[PDB]
Paper text:
Here we report the discovery of type IV borosin natural product pathways (termed ‘split borosins’), featuring an iteratively acting α-N-methyltransferase and separate precursor peptide substrate from the metal-respiring bacterium Shewanella oneidensis. Complexes of SonM and SonA form dimers of heterodimers. A five helical bundle at the N-terminus of SonA, now referred to as the borosin binding domain (BBD; 1–53), serves as the SonA leader peptide and is homologous to a portion of the fused clasp region of OphMA.
To further test the role of the core peptide on the binding of SonA to SonM, the Ki for a BBD-only construct (SonA-BBD; 1–55) was estimated to be 3.9 μM. The active site binding cleft in the SonM—SonA-BBD heterodimer appears largely open, and there are diverse conformational changes compared to the other, cofactor-bound heterodimer. Most prominently, the residue SonM-Y93 that interacts with the cofactor adopts a completely different rotamer (the hydroxyl group of the side chain differs by 7.3 Å between the apo heterodimer SonM—SonA-BBD and the apo SonM—SonA-2Me structure). Indeed, a careful analysis and comparison of both conformations reveals an interaction network between the cofactor SAM, the side clamp, and the top clamp. Specifically, the binding of SAM, and in particular the ribose moiety, appears to sterically hinder and induce a conformational change for residues SonM-W166 and SonM-F99.
Residue numbers in the entry:
A (entry chain A): 2 to 262
B (entry chain B): 3 to 53
C (entry chain C): 2 to 263
D (entry chain D): 4 to 54
Write the structure that this text describes.
């Protein structure tokens, strides 16, 4: 048995890598977590031996810690590897970006002496730079899970593009609910107001998952975030609020002057 | 038919460029119903999953 | 005419998206900014009508402003679009990451009333998470260009994975052109030592570009960075110096405590 | 050699076969002794010559 974790990107059918599609095609069995039924149909035509990981999320009125969903997904994948199957995990986007299941399954498979690896995919962030026409390399960029930002002591650099992922469950502490409330979002706005003005323009971004679909690129003042309609697929982009300042201490050591930049 | 069309449109750059020029003509030529074409042109993703 | 800018990702042939390969295949003309010779040969076999943008860079040690080179590249692309060609630009990795020519050409094409768009691709950053088995979301992620990090005030969050890009040319400048790599990297170590111990394990990462080649993943103490052999593709990963600590102020506002976290 | 590297990069079955015995797979795909030796020794600058 062996494990390869691949990403399908965000857009239906066309955003998977050539090699990643080849892994799915040649797999004994595929474990899938895909955005919608169109993607599921596409995958099933590529390889009919699919197990949908969606089934391990809390269903008909069950209270289930998301950690236990992830553990059951990892166990399901590893059961196929242990049985001797050439196993592929097909996750939407990049399988290792704001996703623990692939990282966990690869670690566990390696510990049990199985061949395992991750193939990079096109993430929601990769789609965001393209759709917004931003070069994040030169500009710099930062990413935090919205809840981790609230529950733990994080400091953003307000001169640099800030992404808050999973904004729709921001401050939901139980990990048993798949939304949050405007009171939790109001507390996040107050937290962000340390560095970002209340009238600071932020962007609710949703990459399109279908080729007939335009992305959501919704500009609004930070203050209005708590009233905004958010989806599980929503990412919040907070552009810089603060002008760059010269690092005089380091420029001096380099022997270069501000005038020169 | 709708799923087959979206899958081809997603991965076929010739079809995608044709679709950008004349979405309704391309959708008709791929067997979509007027109901499906209306759901697409009004950007109603929930109704598309339905149809 | 029309413009689509696509990325090939980092790895030869296999890392391009299915749609992006289709765009190259069906293009009237392709403008390439690819490295290698294997990358260039792969492209030319997919679509023989390729113009190599590399031709517009200074050759023969002539003084040539980067601004002028990029303008000449964008003008060459737009001339094809203007003439009525279905024009595709094939860039390395993600066509919008550490690249201005694609953004500039798309802006100018739209302004002239042409259809133009960018297709996202797999970046060196995408490859790093997969190769290192690190999730940017685990404790958060900050990416800076190493020179921008030195020239400007950017105080990192040392609970995050911190990436310094283009580490080989950190602090490099016309003024500091006679300074040596080792000298400039020693200044960066002293800067980072504000937040990271000198024995802090860091990672020099280079994504592989050929399927017969493994990525560079070199783990060394921060203090040893100035002695390291670096490539233009080299990136510095600085793992967290501090564990995550509870935000009692915000937990208080949420009316919960640590024992309440699922 | 270029044709082989392209196939190896794109084809998950060839990539897995190659990992299990690189020299046998490279022989089967008609690579030269010097090409195979350059691959196995990571001599990238020699691979330039022979392409
Ligand atoms: C569990 S993570 C999965 C991310 C995925 N592995 C990727 O590469 O983008 C879910 C989060 O990713 C982001 N996300 C997922 N789909 C998105 C989309 N279509 N547009 C924007 N952000 C999206 C959101 O922040 C969402 O809460």
């Amino acid at each position: 048995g062996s494990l390869v974790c691949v990403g399908t990107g965000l857009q239906l059918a066309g955003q998977i890598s050539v090699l990643s599609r080849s892994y799915i095609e040649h797999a004994d069995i595929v474990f899938s977590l895909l955005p919608d039924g169109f993607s599921q149909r596409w995958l099933t035509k590529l390889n009919p031996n699919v197990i949908n990981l969606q089934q391990f999320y809390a269903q008909n009125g069950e209270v289930k810690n998301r950690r236990d969903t992830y553990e059951q997904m990892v166990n399901a994948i590893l059961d196929a590897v242990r049985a001797g199957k050439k196993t592929v995990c097909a996750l939407y986007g990049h399988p290792g970006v704001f996703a623990c299941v692939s990282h966990m399954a690869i670690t566990r498979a390696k510990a049990e002496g199985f061949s395992a690896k991750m193939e990079p995919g096109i993430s929601a962030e990769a789609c965001l730079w393209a759709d917004l026409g931003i070069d994040p390399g030169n500009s710099g960029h930062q990413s935090f899970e919205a809840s981790q930002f609230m529950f733990f002591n994080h400091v953003p650099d307000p001169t640099t593009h800030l992404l808050l992922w999973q904004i729709a469950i921001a401050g939901e502490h139980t990990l048993t609910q798949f939304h949050t409330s405007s009171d939790r979002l109001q507390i996040l706005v107050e937290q962000l107001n340390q560095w970002y003005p209340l009238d600071h323009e932020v962007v609710i971004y949703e990459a399109a998952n279908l080729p007939i679909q335009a992305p959501r690129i919704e500009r609004l003042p930070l203050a209005n975030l708590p009233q905004a309609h958010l989806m599980p697929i929503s990412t919040l982009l907070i552009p810089p609020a603060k002008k760059l300042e010269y690092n005089y201490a380091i420029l001096a050591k380099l022997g270069i002057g501000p005038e020169d930049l | 038919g709708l799923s087959d069309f979206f899958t081809q449109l997603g991965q076929d750059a010739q079809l995608m460029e044709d679709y950008k020029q004349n979405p309704e003509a391309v959708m008709r030529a791929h067997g979509l119903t007027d109901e499906q074409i209306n759901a697409v042109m009004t950007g109603d993703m929930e109704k598309l999953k339905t149809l």
